[PDB]
Nucleic acid binder design. Sequence first.
DNA 1: ATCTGGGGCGGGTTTTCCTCGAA
Lengths: 131, 131, 131, 131, 316, 316, 316
Amino acid sequence: EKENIIGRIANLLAVGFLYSESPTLVDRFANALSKEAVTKVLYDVQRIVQMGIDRSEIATTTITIGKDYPAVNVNSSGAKYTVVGYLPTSQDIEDFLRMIEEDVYYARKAGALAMSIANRIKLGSKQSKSE
Amino acid sequence: EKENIIGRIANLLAVGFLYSESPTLVDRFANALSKEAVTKVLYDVQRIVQMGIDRSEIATTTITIGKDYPAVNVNSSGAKYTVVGYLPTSQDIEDFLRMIEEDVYYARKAGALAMSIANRIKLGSKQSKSE
Amino acid sequence: EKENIIGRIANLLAVGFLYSESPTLVDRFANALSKEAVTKVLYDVQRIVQMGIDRSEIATTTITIGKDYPAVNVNSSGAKYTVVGYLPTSQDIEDFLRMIEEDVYYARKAGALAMSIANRIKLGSKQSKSE
Amino acid sequence: EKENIIGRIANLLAVGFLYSESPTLVDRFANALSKEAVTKVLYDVQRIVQMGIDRSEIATTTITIGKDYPAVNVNSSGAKYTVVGYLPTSQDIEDFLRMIEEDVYYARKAGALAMSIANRIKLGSKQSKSE
Amino acid sequence: MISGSVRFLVNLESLNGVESIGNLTKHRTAPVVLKTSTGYLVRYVPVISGEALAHAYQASLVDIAKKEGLPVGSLSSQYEFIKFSTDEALKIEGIKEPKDYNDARRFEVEVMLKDVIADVGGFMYAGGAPVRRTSRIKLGYMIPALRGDEIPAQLEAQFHVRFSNKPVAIFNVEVSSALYTFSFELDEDLIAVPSTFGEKVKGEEELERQKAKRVKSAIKALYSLLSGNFGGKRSRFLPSMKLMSLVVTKTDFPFMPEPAHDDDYIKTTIMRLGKAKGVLNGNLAKAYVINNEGIEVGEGVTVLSTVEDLVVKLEE
Amino acid sequence: MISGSVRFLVNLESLNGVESIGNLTKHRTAPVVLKTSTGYLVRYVPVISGEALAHAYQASLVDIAKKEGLPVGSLSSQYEFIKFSTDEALKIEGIKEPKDYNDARRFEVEVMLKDVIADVGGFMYAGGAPVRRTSRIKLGYMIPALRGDEIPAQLEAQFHVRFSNKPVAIFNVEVSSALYTFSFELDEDLIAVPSTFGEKVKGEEELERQKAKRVKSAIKALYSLLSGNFGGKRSRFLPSMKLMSLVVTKTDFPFMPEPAHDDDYIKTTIMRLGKAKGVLNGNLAKAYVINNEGIEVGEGVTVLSTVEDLVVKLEE
Amino acid sequence: MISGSVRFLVNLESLNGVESIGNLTKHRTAPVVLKTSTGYLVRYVPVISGEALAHAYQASLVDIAKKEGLPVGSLSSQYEFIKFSTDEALKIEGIKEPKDYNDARRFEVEVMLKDVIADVGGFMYAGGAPVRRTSRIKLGYMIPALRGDEIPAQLEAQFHVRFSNKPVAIFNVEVSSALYTFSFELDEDLIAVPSTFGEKVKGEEELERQKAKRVKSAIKALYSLLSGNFGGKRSRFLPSMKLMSLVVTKTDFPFMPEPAHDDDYIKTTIMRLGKAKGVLNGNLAKAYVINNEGIEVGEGVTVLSTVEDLVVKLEE
DNA sequence: ATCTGGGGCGGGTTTTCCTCGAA
């Protein structure tokens, strides 16, 4: 369940990065040395995602990868991205903050996963444009 | 599948080495005695590759060696290199980290393969310049 | 193909010996009773060769012995040596390690060949200096 | 030219025997049933000769037997010996190893000659001390 | 053997760097073993190299030496502290190589006159007859104090963009802030004294004549580090500083003050100096203090108000 | 016999190297067998050699001996400790070589008068008539505490540059942090006493006269190691040491306290001291404890405040 | 008899050695056959010989015997355990060689009245009338725990340099760290008892008079081996020992406890001892146990706290 | 995020002993 929470936080960070086209929040999250820095990023990334939701540029969907998987579609600057997985719940944020109060390592783990998701999606999108 | 994962990690390390012109990350990876050192290199090499992707100096391609093989083109300091194979997926990084948590030997195996790839490419590039 | 792999490993050991002026790695290789000792020497000799490559004191060349043969030029302490043949590929190292996992005898065979190459080259170099 | 090579190998074995005061390497050479045993002795005897060269206890000279003949002076345990002839070249070692790869008989021939040289020199040295 | 320790307060600084990755300059960081109420932990914290302070001190020493009659070397006249390691510097400055150990002392004296820096800061020459001279000043890293269970140091990246009217310009710089501390040392009993052992050679009289001047210059130099002038990237990242506590001691025997890790570290060093004056037969022990943070001090301690007073007193 | 165990805490340190690969200076590391809940593990950890502390002790001994008027050798007058290993050292010093076994004692006494260091530190002369003399102080490597499931030590590399104006200069230095510990032994009941068997020879009266001074100087020398004055590369990498826990014991019979690995090692050694005295029929056993980390101590044992007090007490 | 098994944990030592090659020292190593999860393997592992322990034990015995007034030989007054083997030793000690077999008991008693070591450590004289006396204490090599698949040991080499001022001095030393275990045997029912078969000769009454003291001293001597006082190169490579587990047993019949390889050799050996007594119809069988690693013990057995208590109880 | 630098040198072990006796 700890890995599932970290994975859902990584999906939130990856969606926020792909939508904003800025690594700054993921950089801040992966370099955090205090609960203050982690909590500030968790707010700021959700505030970016909230704007994308209100603009209908961020939406939840299902995708067949032959079973349907939960996903998040992100439209940014005319690029379309799809992150596979769920976004964190309020309970996942609260449980993740409790994990950070024990060990800030979990912020680095979530940041590393988020950057991996974003990099794979950006690489695939550039390859399809070149073809 | 373990050998395929190790080979894809070795390709990532070789691309990062050829792009940065620095062996330091491969040295750190092959001398790792903890999961901390391995994970730190896996982040730092992917961060170097991310910069090369954003600059369009690192790109995925296919090359005919008479079937098409997946490859990665690397441009560094006016030198052009081509690494044959795939880069690791997020799942390959996660499965590789699980292999490292069982036995750090797999980091040495990937480092030895990465240095072999880089050495062969550097030798071929120097020979073509001398001709 | 097994003999070709052993011969290429012997060339690597001979180049490392002539460049370092130390038999210690060849002694360790020929006395190995485990895959650990063999693999440690394969790294350490390639690390010595890597320094010679970076210093441009080790380079691949062709020599006419009336067809061109692949060779490796080695400059050490103002002495010039030429080893005839190829250095091992990453695949040769991997296939050689698999041969060692079956029978450590192949490390003794490669060590005996490497010492023969080095001795013949050292004898020829001393004779030309005496003339 | 095969007999000249065998004679130069026999001179090397005789010099190594007279300097080390040990027949063990000549015994191993004359009893060899494989190229491995022959090559190991060719290294070990040259390693003994190398120590005698570095100590200036083994030196090349000419001796008048009324023309000058090439010879090797050997000083061991306060005894002085002179072997008449040349030491083998690197090419002689390589051509001799090729002869051994065809027929190990040539190692027995060189061993028999080496023991004859050493015995004649030891007999002459003991006679002069008794007079 | 003038020893001492110092504490500093800084904010929004970047006074060193290491190999940079991408568009983010990396502030130097190091591991530390920390003690807490539970046990010993490992942490990573920003630090400042020890060689930067040595460079700043040597530069200030050169600046104050050229202001008087003391000599300075050609290469070191420009701020390039290579001294006489390689043969190229020897050829440029015009000094013959050392022939053999018998000549070695000569060489040193010959080298020890042209350049005061090569004397105060020691040097090395590698060759057939290597020659050494250990530095007369010693320094270490500038770590934040490990007081308490919380390290009072923070680090964080920043964002900066370069304007452009024809986009086809973005960079990040790390910034740190911590309560720094460090200890130094300087042994004035060996300045202008040859180290190699051998028969005396001509010119040593001249060395003896200027010993007082060289010692005065070396003592004056320390004001550079005491004030705060050091570190790179000050053209735009100018860090605010404010001295908090200092301790300087003069003796005639080996001695080292307590690292500035506790609210009460002046008292311990004073007591140890008082008790150690006797354990090793000595004939001089003086201490000074410049306190501005209201920590425990004790009694029988000369108290000043500015570093200038301390420098003047030490010169006296 | 004075034995002891000490626990130091060192940060941002490099006090010993081994070799260099490329442009990297290598710290000294070694294996250790460690115990954890799961079982037995093999780990590689940085260590400080045992011959980097004997040198410091002998240097302090030479300094104090010269200062107090005791004899000191010729080569050892300079800080070279070949002592009398080879014939060249004997020729320079001015002593004759032993003729046969019967004369051996004679030679020793002569060597044992010229140089104090050759007496408290032992020596070896290899010739037709070899002579040996084991040391009177014994030391061992400085390992970090193998406590718990996490060794509290760290090792890393750092990047440094040499500035220049005509590029045509980069080096990597290893730095370590640890919670070091070690133990030491000194037997003052054999100082200034010949260790070879034979008939009496003239000159031993002077040794009997100087025994008290020699023992006092040797005991005073330990303050060097106990204070924290040792190691190399101190000029630009001056460490930040700090004393946490120390236990010393003076007895009449062989005895060694517990290593400093476990948090509870003060109590065990004190408890074992009395029983050891009872079993071995001793006549004197005292223990001194210096504590600052706040762990279990025991009862009926002195509590000091600083190391300087322990040297005075031992001298008394 | 008294028989026991002991488990040690040594770090960074070099106790036993063998011939050196080049400029490198060699640590004794031996082959061992080990059982794995896939079969049987042959490995090479460091080992501490079995005669260093004997020498340490006999030296401690000499010390205590001379302290308490028991007779001690002349050559054994110094630590030269040639014993009464060669004719020169007899000539120095002043004993006539035996004439015929009928004189063997006289010779044995005369030798045994002059040297406790030749009694509690056996001896051999070779000649026209050979005489033997098997040792009363038995020891074997010290091997690391051959448990599971991973032997917990490691052997490395270290680099050392002898500094000088006139270069014209480098060596390498092997260092190990392992979990050592060994077993020891002794029998107090044969001390002070002639072995050879013949007729009673005068003086045996004195032998019977001193038997209690000799046995007491022999039992006391073990404390040296059990406390970690043995091996060479202790001047600069003092190890860091610690006692993990120990089992000792006093009986009336032959009995050998389980080696200390497997995790549970205490419960197994106690269960075996419970039944061996009934099997062989003895009358005394006691077991003492020290446990620091928290391994399975059993119930209704002694639990001591140190080695001193064990030695005291064995004495009682 | 654009450059440029990527180590130099002296040392690389000396001694003492190399099995006694009964069958």
